[PDB]
Amino acid sequence: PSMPFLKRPSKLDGSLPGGEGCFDPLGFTEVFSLEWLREAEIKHCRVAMLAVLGVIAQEFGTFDFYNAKSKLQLSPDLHNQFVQNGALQQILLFVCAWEFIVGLPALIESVNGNREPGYFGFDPLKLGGTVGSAQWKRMQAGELRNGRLAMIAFGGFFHQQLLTKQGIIEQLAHF
């Protein structure tokens, strides 16, 4: 098939930046028109890369004056420390300023089909921010791969709780 897999040869996609191929074994692009899903893939992979760098950076010891970590999940020590602090509200609310205000119409631009649904502009880099064909697509696939690895990697950075009950660095300090 056009897939590098069992068989479903180019159900709808293939020209998108999956450089190792078009994966799609379950019928989502069959009936979801794929642009919504591409925005969901890219937005989840961006926020997952911020998630995994958040977990690592919080495990490398930074607090102005707060509670010590011992984990970075399981709400009433970490997550529901800051909600009752009245602290994570605004860092959600500016995301509301990002999503409802300048992300929801952009998603509308990612419905009518004039978006290429990454692309909030945003290249503050000289000598390497090629907007064109080669480096833009081969770097968009790199954002995509490191973002997907951030998605599963953040799954593993969450679910080391039952036989861990500890950090990830202290998971490395035991086997």
């Binding site: 300048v102 119409p105 631009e109 502009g121 945003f122």
Partner: protein
């Protein structure tokens, strides 16, 4: 102007203060010239209104109030004292002559190329040039700074002034 192809609204680029920004497409349905007039007027009266929060310092306290730097119940201090009704008489009896059509969306008097009425302009060094843009930036800045002074008076309540020096929550 906003990069993700969100720039065919009902606006026009030759309008003063233009920088290409309406993601929630309020330019549609709301008469872009009247919205421009509302941004100009909110900017100017917000501009004066936060200028009052800079002239709460010792100058010009003529015998009537004696209670400076309150900014909260100061509204209660001058509603209670009276004559803020009379400053609505001052603004109301001016503004009838400012616009002369004086109704919000019905019959906006688009005559003089610009939301600026009669040229209240005795000094009159610029005309309606790109000085209008640096009126708009000094209007929007004086909107958000006005809000920051008031919410600084809300939760802290300490100082409109001395939050700038070394005072932090």
């Amino acid at each position: 102007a906003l990069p993700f192809l969100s720039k065919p609204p009902n606006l026009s680029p030759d309008m003063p203060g233009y920088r290409g920004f309406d993601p929630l497409r309020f330019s549609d349905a709301f008469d872009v010239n009247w919205l421009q007039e509302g941004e100009i007027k909110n900017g100017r009266v917000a501009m004066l209104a936060c200028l009052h929060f800079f002239v709460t310092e010792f100058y010009q306290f003529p015998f009537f109030a004696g209670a400076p730097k309150l900014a909260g119940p100061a509204h209660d201090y001058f509603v209670k004292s009276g004559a803020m009704i009379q400053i609505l008489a001052f603004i109301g009896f001016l503004e009838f002559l400012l616009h002369r059509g004086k109704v919000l969306y019905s019959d906006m008097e688009w005559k003089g190329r610009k939301p600026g009425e009669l040229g209240f302009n005795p000094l009159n060094l610029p005309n309606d040039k790109a000085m209008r843009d640096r009126e708009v930036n000094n209007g929007r800045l004086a909107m958000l700074g006005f809000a920051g002074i008031i919410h600084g008076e809300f939760l802290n309540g300490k100082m409109p002034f001395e939050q700038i020096t070394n005072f932090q929550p």
